[PDB]
Amino acid sequence: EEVIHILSKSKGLVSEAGLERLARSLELEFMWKRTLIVAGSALELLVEFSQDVVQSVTLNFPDIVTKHAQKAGEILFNDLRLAPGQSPLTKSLARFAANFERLAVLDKLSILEAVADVYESLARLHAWELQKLREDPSLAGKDDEYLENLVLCTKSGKPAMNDRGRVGLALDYEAEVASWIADNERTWSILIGCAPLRDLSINPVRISDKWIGPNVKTSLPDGLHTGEPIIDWLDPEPTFIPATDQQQQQPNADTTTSKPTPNAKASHKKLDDFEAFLAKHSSHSGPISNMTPSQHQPSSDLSIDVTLRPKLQIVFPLHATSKEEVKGKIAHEEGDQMEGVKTEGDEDGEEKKRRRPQPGDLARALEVLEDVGKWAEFVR
Amino acid sequence: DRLTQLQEAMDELLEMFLSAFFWVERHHDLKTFGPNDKIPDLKADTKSPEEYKAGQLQLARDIIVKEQQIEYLISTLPGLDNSEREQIQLLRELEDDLVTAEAQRQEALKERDEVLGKLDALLRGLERP
Amino acid sequence: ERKNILIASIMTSYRDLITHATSPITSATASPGHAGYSSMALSTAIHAAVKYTEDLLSLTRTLREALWVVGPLTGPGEKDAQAEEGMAKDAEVVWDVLNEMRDRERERMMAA
Amino acid sequence: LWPDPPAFWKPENIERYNALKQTRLAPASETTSDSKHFDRGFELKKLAKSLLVNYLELMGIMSINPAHASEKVQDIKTIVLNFHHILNEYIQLMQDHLDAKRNETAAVRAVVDKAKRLIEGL
Amino acid sequence: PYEIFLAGVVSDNKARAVLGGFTEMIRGFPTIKELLKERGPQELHNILVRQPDAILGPAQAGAEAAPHGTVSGGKPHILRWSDIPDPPNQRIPPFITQRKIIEIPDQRAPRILAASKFRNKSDLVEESYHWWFNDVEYSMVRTLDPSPQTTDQVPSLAGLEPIGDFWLLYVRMRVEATPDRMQQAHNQLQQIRDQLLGVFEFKVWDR
Amino acid sequence: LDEIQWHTNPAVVGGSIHDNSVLFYFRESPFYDKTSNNEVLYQQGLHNQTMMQFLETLREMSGLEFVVAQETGTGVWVINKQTRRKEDEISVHGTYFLVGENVYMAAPTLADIISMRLASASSSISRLLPIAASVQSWSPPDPRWLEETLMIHEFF
Amino acid sequence: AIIKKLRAAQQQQAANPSSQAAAGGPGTTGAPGSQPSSSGPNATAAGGAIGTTSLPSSATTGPTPSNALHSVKELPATTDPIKHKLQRARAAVRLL
Amino acid sequence: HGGHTRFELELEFVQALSNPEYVNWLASRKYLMNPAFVAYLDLQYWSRPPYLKYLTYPTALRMLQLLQSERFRQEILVPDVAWQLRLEGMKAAVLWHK
Amino acid sequence: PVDIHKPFTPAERIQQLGEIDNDIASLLQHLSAALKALATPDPVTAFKTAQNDFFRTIDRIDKHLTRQIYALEEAGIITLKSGTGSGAGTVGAGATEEQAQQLPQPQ
Amino acid sequence: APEELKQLELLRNRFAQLQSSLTSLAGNLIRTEPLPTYESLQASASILQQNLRSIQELMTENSDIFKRIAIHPSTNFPGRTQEHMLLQLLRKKLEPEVESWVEEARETARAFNEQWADMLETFQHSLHHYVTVQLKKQYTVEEQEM
């Protein structure tokens, strides 16, 4: 029957109780000593005869990438080591499954693979995009987040793979020696993988030695051809963003109540975020419904209004040549019980994209702007 | 005391002599006394003849030690200076010695309990639980 | 009865008492112990002669001493006495009434 | 009968008399407490016998001082009374009398020999 | 109906003395002049009548007539009455009467039932005093000889063998359905008889 | 003066205490008659009849005499002294109880003239005033509320 | 050190729930043996049930023993206070 | 005087009352009723510190207090209790019962 | 009978019975003198006079009490119950007096 | 001797009546808690007084014979005469109250106090005249009508 697909898909939840390694993605191993070996790497876990003790992985001979090992342990093992407090029965192997996922797919395709990466020839760009900042705002460490307008990548920060970064919700600033922000802020991602191709409009894998000239003026050469041709890769998005009906060159009156936190500030301030400060600037004063602030982003932003005797109410379309408008109204170290409410005039379709694969090098680092210009925080 | 017992013994010795002599006479004399051919046995006083004149060396030998016992305690008398004023001169100290050494032990029971009583408020309230 | 107990008290008691002047005054020529006897005679005669609360009762609380009639209930004709002062104030209050009445019509602005 | 009393002097008016008359560390305290208690108690209870020894010394001094003389006087009275009817006839055999006189003579001699030595002091 | 009557005569040679004695056992003394009109039927038509011994008699309170005289008092509701005779079989308490009686607002229904069967006969007029203390209509009445019939009573002479105002203690409770109340009334009557046994005495007599 | 005995009489010497010699105690009693027949005959008992056997003969004489009547638990003796001075005319002028080695005698006046002076003098004391008051004088919350709970105390 | 059924043995769901029984030539056809495996899973579940019912006391109410623990902590504090006061008094004492 | 001797007659009386039967005899003669007599008796030259050595019946001391006791006079007046007083364990009382 | 006059005056009449108590008491005075005279070894009645004093006072008391008995007449008891515990007064009118006695208030 | 047996028997009977009355009084006293009635005590005292008078009477007229009478027993004497309760029965020793009776305080000017029946004569005269005196009117005032 046709619906057996949906029947099997409905149980897309793993057992997630540990102590039984049945990933069964066509790997191979043996019991006592549950070491596994593929045409690529090898993973050896010497769990206790009743629970987990030690785990390690040897990236069987590649190439240089072997040095990139010895950090896979502190991420995989760190997901099976269970002693924050006491928890002999509650240990769901969902995170470990997710991290293990992104390696079996690469090992399943090796041909004599995880070797063709670009980060080695991409860290040059990151190292150079700081020396472009000889200007000295006297920040001492804020330039590294200021670099989130153009480019940033990393390897194995939180997950066990290569990825990138963009706008990280602060961008403008804090003694706080603890890492309380590290588990409360969300730099998003851009993942990277490889997958079989079906439509012959995409170049195969071009195994690489250089993509960029010997002097960075922003040139971009390309790899060449002919490794007994191969099958190319792909990359997903962490938190899929709904883009409007653009797809170029690959009534409602709901309301809520919240509690802001004002302590002491100027005559009257916003409620939702910080950047509404600098955008709200024609001069030092004169906020008489100027109705045209910039609010600089890869896609610009729109108007503002305020009444007098001043219970505000504002309007913000998106003048990115798509020109769709919305608006919200407002009524009134401690909560203030504001009145959030939104009403929209027109409607249209949104895409909500999560993954599209690229044919080559540049096609990924080109569209970052439009993505950045698509933040719609709307705190709830 | 010693004098008392020796005196009463010396006296009761006479009662013993009367008990001996006249009872041995009541043991009628089968002697060769000079009445006529009527052995005086009944009116002028068989009974065991073992004491008439043999008893003068049979039963009196039982009493020779009873009459020699007297000299025993004779040696036990306290013969010394009959003006015993020395002993009282040398013992009169004791009447004050015991009280002087006592004052400490008199106050002891009480005051050694009192070094505890100064604390007994707490030493007896502490049992709170 | 309740006023002839008088006799059976006065005579009976306080003649039989004075007739015990004989018991002591009898001639004495015979016996030495009958005095020890006769002591009882007088020492009871005088405690008999002390019988006077039971006469003071029937003297003071004789019948009533305070209230002597079968009390009927009738009606007096003396209400007129208060009726006079009542009628005086009755005929007098109307003066205060008319005095106040004048106050109503005392107000005048334009009418007639 | 009885000599009924001579109650001459008898009274309450007596002012003559009285008129002339106008002419984990407390173990330390526990142990020292026990020690002091025991020492004091023992010393007290023991050395009281001083009373008994003084009583004995005084009693002995008394019992020897005058009563020795009374004994020394009453002793020879018995010997003086012993010679009731004895005479030098060796009227009966009186062998019991002779042997008695010998025995009590020896006894009195021993008593006297003790007595003369007894009074060492002067 | 039902009630527990009681009566006993005394000579009026002692009227004032007994009035005094009765003044207390609380109130004053009200006087009432009354008149009656006995009638006899002829046609023998009894639904709820029982003519033979239950013949009819109306009573009219000549209240002002006392100070006025001749009887003309139809305005007061002339209470018609028809009673059973002296019922035997009880002697602990006194007799218990059954007198169906009611008043009506000057209703000529008396004349109507007369035209039916009845006709007025000789009748009387009485005087009474009523010293109602509490729950017992203590009264003393007398039919000072009313030779007339529902009119003035100038002669006002003796009425019967009992000459002298006759006393009456009435406890009128037509609701005999409560035997508890009946026994309680019997107890109260025995109690007051005991309390008054001093001078006043009473038992069945001859009218 | 014959109410109770007394001892100026400590000697038992005279004589043997029996019929023969029981009267010597009276012969030397605290009170002697000094003139009776025995006192005028046997005081001459020197070298003459000096025994009760002879005394049993004197009724023959004419004067004051004595007779023993009883010999009575263990020692009840009685002497019925009389004065038979004339012929055969006795005059009893007093008896004597000799039990308890002394003399005793009492008159029956006692039985009344002690009972009177005891009973009257005793019973005549109950006339103390017991109580005295009357109309004139002859005939004489919260804490008050705990009682109402007494019975309920046991109940519950 | 729990003696109950093993954590992993108490598998929440059959890992191979389908057991590769996709309706084609390649399908688990041991339907009766599959029912037997399910009955074995149910027997293991009942064993875990018995072990749980018999394992823990579950003292009073999941809150009452917590209240009792607070009470016991207060009592322990008070008791320690008494021994401390006693030791301090003993120290103040024993001067002479 | 009418009575010749003085001192021995003074003390023979005060120390004469050894056994009670005689004092029962005296209570019979009711000399104790006399207030002058009792006041004179409450005569104790012997018991004092001085004029004490001469006494030679040192067990007629409890008697002085038993006599100063008021009610015990008439209490002992009864002959039977007076007899009951005549008993004491001389032997057992080796050391002066008091 | 009221021979001389009625002279009932019941409110005052009380005084007689109020003063007879003095004779009743002085009876004991008239008595004690007899004992006091018989005590000493006196003229038999020439020093007593007490018997005749006694008899005089007794006859006087008896006469006065009899005159009181006959001044009263209520045949022992009649209308036996509580005398005039059957009683009602004029407290009503006495109280309502205030209407007239008080309230000449306008003046 | 037999002629006075009736006398002594009458004495015994009257004495038994005394004892019976005494016992009855003793019982009636405790029969209730308070003094029962003053009048009961009065009546009982009178009762005792009558037979006390009885004994007093029986004494005098034959006293002399009692004086002459010595111990002359009969019908039980010689046997029961061991127990020394005879002394207790015949205690002529007076009791302390009998002693404390005071002939003193009267001995003063004593040896006359007799010859005073003229008292009783005057008393008889007065009482006899009073018995005659019963005139209601004036109570011996003997004056005007009123």
Beta bridge partner(s), residue H37: none
**d(C-alpha H43, C-alpha H50), whole Å:** 14
Tokens of I35: 């004992």
- Separation between Cα atoms, residue J146 and residue J139, nearest integer Å: 12
Instruction: Indicate the burial class of B116 (C-beta count within 10 angstroms; 0-12, 13-18, 19 or more).
Output: middle
Cα Rg of chain B (Å, integer) = 35
**I44 found inside a domain:** yes
Question: What does the alpha-carbon distance between residue H68 and residue H38 come to, in Å, rounded to a whole number?
Answer: 9
Instruction: Find all residues with CB under 8 Å of D50, minimum gap 6, and list them.
Output: B94, B97, B98
- Do A244 and A324 touch, CB atoms closer than 8 A? yes
Structure tokens at E51: 């003519």
Nearest beta carbon to residue D44 from set B7, B80, B105: B105
The answer to whether residue B109 neighbours chain D at the CB level (below 8 Å) is yes
Give yes or no: residues G45 and G66 share one domain.
no
Q: What is the dihedral of CA H1, H4, H10, H15, to 10 degrees?
A: -140
| Cα–Cα distance measured from residue B59 to residue B50, given in angstroms and rounded to the nearest whole number | 9
Q: Please, are residues E26 and E115 in contact by the beta-carbon 8 Å criterion?
A: no
Distances (CA, A) of B5 to B2, B11, D112: 5, 10, 18
Contact D95, B52 (CB under 8 A): no
Beta-strand relationship, E139-142 and E166-168: antiparallel
Considering only CB atoms, which chain G residues are within 8 Å of A88?
A: 2, 7
How many CB atoms neighbour CB A200 within 10 A? 7
CB H60 within 8 A of CB H88: no
CB distance from I86 to chain C under 8 Å?
yes
The CA distance from G30 to F104, in Å, is 146
Which of H13, H25, H40 faces D10 most closely, judged by CB atoms? H40
F107–J66 CB contact, under 8 Å: yes
C-alpha neighbours within 13 Å on the C-beta side of residue F48: 7
Q: Which two tokens stand for residue I37?
A: 């005279």
CA-nearest residue to B94 within chain D is D50
Q: Which residue in chain D is spatially nearest to G83 when comparing CA positions?
A: D24
Minimum CA–CA partner of I78 in chain E = E199
Size of interface D-H (CB pairs under 8 A): 25
Q: Give the integer Cα–Cα distance in Å for A143 and A137.
A: 9
What are the start-end ranges of the E strands in chain E?
7-8, 31-36, 39-41, 57-61, 79-83, 99-102, 118-120, 125-130, 139-142, 166-168
Calculated CA dihedral for residues G52, G54, G57, G61, nearest 10 degrees? 60
Residues G50 and G76 in one domain: no
Contacts of A125 (CB under 8 A, 6+ apart): A151, A212, A216
Q: How are beta strands E7-8 and A255-258 bridged, if at all?
A: unpaired
Resolution (A): 4.2
Q: Which two tokens stand for residue G44?
A: 């293991």
Task: Answer whether A365's CB lies under 8 Å from A380's CB.
Answer: no
Distant-in-sequence, close-in-space partners of G84: CB < 8 Å, separation ≥ 6? none
Any chain H CB within 8 A of the CB of D15? no
Q: Quote the domain boundaries for residue I36.
A: 1-73
Enumerate the β-bridge partners of residue F97.
Answer: F78, F104
> Max Cα separation, chain G?
102
> Residue F78's beta-bridge partner residues?
F97
Report the C-alpha gap between A299 and A297 in whole angstroms.
5
Regarding chains D and I, contact by 3 or more CB pairs under 8 A is answered as no
**Please, how many CA atoms are within 13 Å of residue C4, restricted to the half-sphere of its CB?**
4
Chain B contacts of D29, Cβ < 8 Å? 116
- CB distance D32–G86 less than 8 Å? no
What are the angstrom distances between the C-alpha of I37 and each of C49, I32, I49, J104, J119?
19, 9, 10, 21, 11
**Domains of chain H by residue range:** 7-85
With a CB cutoff of 8 Å and minimum separation 6, the contacts of A56 are A43, A44, A45, A73, A77
Question: Are residues A38 and A151 both part of a single domain?
Answer: no
Check: CB of residue I18 under 8 Å from CB of residue I33.
no
Nearest CA in chain G to D26: G90
Count how many residues are written for chain F: 156
What is the distance between the alpha carbons of residues I104 and C85, in angstroms, rounded to a whole number?
8
CA atoms of E171 and E187, how far apart (whole Å): 12
Residues of chain I in Cβ contact (below 8 Å) with chain E:
79-81, 85-88
Between CA F52 and CA F61 the distance in angstroms is 16
3-state secondary structure of G95: coil
d(CA B129, CA B111): 29
- Distance from the first to the final alpha carbon of chain C: 94
Q: Mark yes or no for CB contact C70/E21 under 8 Å.
A: yes
User: What is the count of structural domains for chain C?
Assistant: 1
- Terminal C-alpha separation, chain I: 57
Angle at A187 between CA A183 and CA A192, to 5 degrees: 120
CB E11 within 8 Å of CB E164: yes
Q: Which residue has tokens 């008292």?
A: J119
Question: With the C-alpha atoms ordered I1, I7, I13, I19, is the resulting torsion angle positive or negative?
Answer: negative
Given a contact cutoff of 8 angstroms between Cβ atoms, the answer to whether I53 and I30 are in contact is yes
Q: Residue E26 carries which side chain, given as an amino acid letter? A: I
Contact (CB, 8 A) for E46 and E24: no
Contact partners for chain B, using 3 or more CB pairs closer than 8 A, are: D, G
Q: Domain coordinates of chain D in residue numbers?
A: 24-65, 66-122
Burial class (CB in 10 A: 0-12, 13-18, 19+), G14: middle
Q: Does domain E7-195 have CATH number 3.40.50.720?
A: no
Beta-strand runs (E) in chain A = 36-37, 42-46, 54-58, 153-155, 162-164, 236-241, 255-258, 313-315, 326-331, 338-344, 353-355
Buried b (16+ CB within 10 A) or exposed e, C1-13: eebeebeeeeeee
Q: How many domains does the structure of chain J reveal?
A: 1
In a domain, C3, yes or no: yes
Q: Is residue A378 part of a domain?
A: no
- DSSP state, F64? E
Comparing C-alpha atoms, which of F2, F1, F33 is closest to residue F98?
A: F2
Helix (H, G, I), strand (E, B), or coil: what is residue C96? helix
Query: Which helix (DSSP H) or strand (DSSP E) does residue F95 occupy?
Result: strand F92-97
Nearest CA in chain H to D7: H37
| Cα-Cα end-to-end distance for chain D | 55
What's the CA angle centered on B5, arms B2 and B11, to 5 degrees?
140
Angle at the Cα of I65 from the Cα atoms of I59 and I66, rounded to 5 degrees: 90
Q: Are F52 and F26 within 8 A, CB to CB?
A: no
Element (H, E) at F63: strand F63-65
Which residues make beta-bridge pairs with E4?
E96
Alpha carbon distance A109, A160 (integer Å): 19
- Contact (Cβ atoms closer than 8 angstroms) between residue I34 and residue I48: yes
| Residue with the two structure tokens 């006046």 | F109
Nearest Cβ partner of G7 from A11, A14, A88? A88
Find the closest chain D residue to B109 by CA distance.
Answer: D37
How close is the nearest chain D Cα to the Cα of B92, in Å? 9
Q: Which residue of D has its CA nearest to G84?
A: D24
F13-23 CB burial, b ≥16 within 10 A, e <16: eeeeeeeeebb
**What is the number of other CB atoms lying within 10 angstroms of the CB of residue E123?**
18
Domain contains C101: no
Does the beta-carbon distance from C37 to F120 stay under 8 Å? yes
Task: Return d(Cα D54, Cα D62) in angstroms, integer.
Answer: 12
- Report the SS3 class of residue A78: helix
3-state secondary structure (DSSP) of residue A339: strand
Note whether A touches C: 3 CB pairs or more under 8 A: no
Backbone angles phi, psi at C97, to 5 degrees: -60, -50
* Residue from the list F124, F136, F138 with its beta carbon closest to the beta carbon of C39: F124
Number of CB pairs < 8 Å for C and F? 37
Query: Is the domain of G78 the same as that of G93?
Result: yes
Distance CA J138, CA J146 (A): 8
- Contact present, E and J (at least 3 Cβ pairs less than 8 Å): no
Contacts A89 to G, Cβ<8 Å: 7, 10
Q: What is the number of CB-based contacts under 8 A between chain I and chain J?
A: 30
Rounded to a whole number of angstroms, the distance from the CA of I77 to the nearest CA of chain C is: 9
Residue with tokens 């009435």: E170
- I45 touches J: beta carbon within 8 Å: yes
In a domain, I12, yes or no: yes
Residue of D26, D28, D32 lying closest to G86 (CB–CB)? D26
CA E24, CA I92: separation in Å to the nearest integer? 18
Which residues from F are below 8 Å from J54, CB to CB? none
Phi, psi (deg, nearest 5) at residue E166 = -90, 135
The residue count for chain E:
207
**Residues A19, G6: C-beta atoms closer than 8 Å:** yes
Question: Could you tell me how many residues make up chain H?
Answer: 98
Which chain E residue's Cα is nearest to I83? E21
The pair phi, psi for residue A330, each rounded to 5°, is -145, 135
Q: Does G78 touch chain B (CB under 8 A)?
A: yes
Instruction: Copy the structure tokens of residue A123.
Output: 């860290």
- Residue window 73-102, chain I: list those with CB within 8 Å of chain J: none
**Alpha helices (H) in I2-45, listed in sequence order:** 10-39
Tokens 């003094």 found at = J35
Are residues G94 and D24, on separate chains, in Cβ contact within 8 Å?
Answer: no
b/e sequence G36-52, b meaning 16+ C-beta within 10 Å: eeeeeeeeeeeebeeee
Measured between CB atoms, which of I3, I4, I60 is closest to J139? I60
Q: How open is the CA angle B125-B126-B128, to the nearest 5 degrees?
A: 85
Q: What is the largest CA-CA distance in chain C?
A: 136
Beta bridge partners of A255: A341
- Superfamily of the domain at F24-101: Mediator complex, subunit Med6 (3.10.450.580)
Q: How far apart are CA H38 and CA H30, in angstroms?
A: 11
Q: Would you state the structure tokens that stand for residue B9, as one six-digit string?
A: 């013994």
In a domain? residue A269: yes
Structural domain of C36: 1-63
H or E element at residue F84: strand F78-84
List the domain range (segments joined by +) for residue G77: 61-96
In 10 A of CB A116, how many CB atoms?
A: 15
Establish if A17 belongs to a structural domain. yes
Q: DSSP secondary structure string, F5-41?
A: ---S-----S--TTTTTSTHHHHTSSS--SSSHHHHH
Taking an 8 Å cut-off on Cβ atoms, the answer to whether C2 and I99 are in contact is no
Query: Are G65 and G94 part of one and the same domain?
Result: yes
CB neighbours of residue B2 within 10 Å: 14
> After which residues, if any, is chain H broken (C to N > 2.5 Å)?
42
F61 Ramachandran zone, left/alpha/beta (phi>0; psi -120 to 50): beta
In contact, H47 and H61? CB cutoff 8 Å: yes
Map residue B59 onto helix, strand or coil: coil
Q: Which residues of A touch G17 (CB under 8 A)?
A: 11
DSSP string computed for E116-163: HTEEE----EEEEEE---SSS--EEEE--B--SSSS--SS-B--STT-
Residue A262 backbone class (left: φ over 0; alpha: ψ -120 to 50; beta: rest)? beta
Can you read off the two tokens belonging to residue H15?
């120390």
Of E51, E69, E168, E199, give the one whose Cα is nearest residue E118.
E51
Number of H helices, E strands in chain D: 4, 0
Beta bridge partners of A36: A29, A43
Assigned domain for A273 exists = yes
H31 contacts D5? CB cut-off 8 A: yes
* Residue E138 neighbours by CB under 8 Å, 6+ apart: E22, E130, E131, E132, E167, E168, E169
Apex CA E19: angle with CA E16 and CA E22, to 5°?
Answer: 155
Backbone angles phi, psi at F94, to 5 degrees: 135, 135
What would the two tokens of residue E26 be?
Answer: 């609380």
How many structural domains are present in chain I?
1
Secondary structure class of E172 (helix, strand, coil) = strand
β-pairing, A54-58 vs A42-46, is antiparallel
Q: Three-class SS string for chain J?
A: CHHHHHHHHHHHHHHHHHHHHHHHHHHHHHHCCCCCCHHHHHHHHHHHHHHHHHHHHHHHCCHHHHHHCCCCCCCCHHHHCCCCHHHHHCCCCCCHHHHHCCCCCCCCCCCCCCCCCHHHHHHHHHHHHHHHCCCCHHHHCCCCCC
Residue type, A99: N
Tokens at B115, concatenated? 């070094």
3-state SS assignment for residue C57: helix
As a whole number of angstroms, the distance between CA A271 and CA A280 comes to: 13
Q: Note which residues in 55-94 of chain J have CB less than 8 A from chain I.
A: none
Same domain, A219 and A137: yes
Task: Name the experiment that determined this structure.
Answer: cryo-EM
Cβ under 8 Å to I: J residues 23-42: none
Taking CA atoms, what residue in G is nearest to D32? G94
Domain boundaries, chain F: 24-101
Best residue in J47, J49, J67 to probe C by mutation, most C CBs within 10 Å? J49
Q: Do J133 and I62 touch (CB under 8 A)?
A: no
Range of the domain at A290: 252-346
Q: Phi/psi at C27 (nearest 5 deg)?
A: -65, 145
> CB of E33 within 8 A of CB of E66?
yes
Ramachandran quadrant class, E74 (left: phi over 0; alpha: psi -120 to 50; beta: rest): alpha
As a whole number of angstroms, the distance between CA A92 and CA F22 comes to: 140
Nearest-by-CA chain J residue for I5: J146
What would the two tokens of residue D13 be? 């008016």
Q: Helices (DSSP H) in chain A: which residue ranges?
A: 4-10, 73-76, 94-107, 119-131, 143-146, 368-372
| Closest residue of chain E to C71, computed from CA coordinates | E20
Q: Does G77 touch chain B (CB under 8 A)?
A: no
| Sign of the torsion formed by the C-alpha atoms of D83, D84, D86 and D87 | positive
Q: Which residues pair with A37 in a beta bridge?
A: A42
CA distances in angstroms from D95 to B31, B56, D87, F27, F127, listed in the order given? 14, 9, 12, 57, 94
What six digits make up the tokens of H35?
């207030």
Picking from J116, J119, J130, the nearest residue to I55 by CB comes out as J130
The CA distance from J27 to J23, in Å, is 6
Q: Note whether G11 contacts A19, CB cutoff 8 Å.
A: no
Question: Which of these, B20, B52, B57, B55, lies nearest to B33 by C-alpha position?
Answer: B52
At residue G9, what is the residue type? A
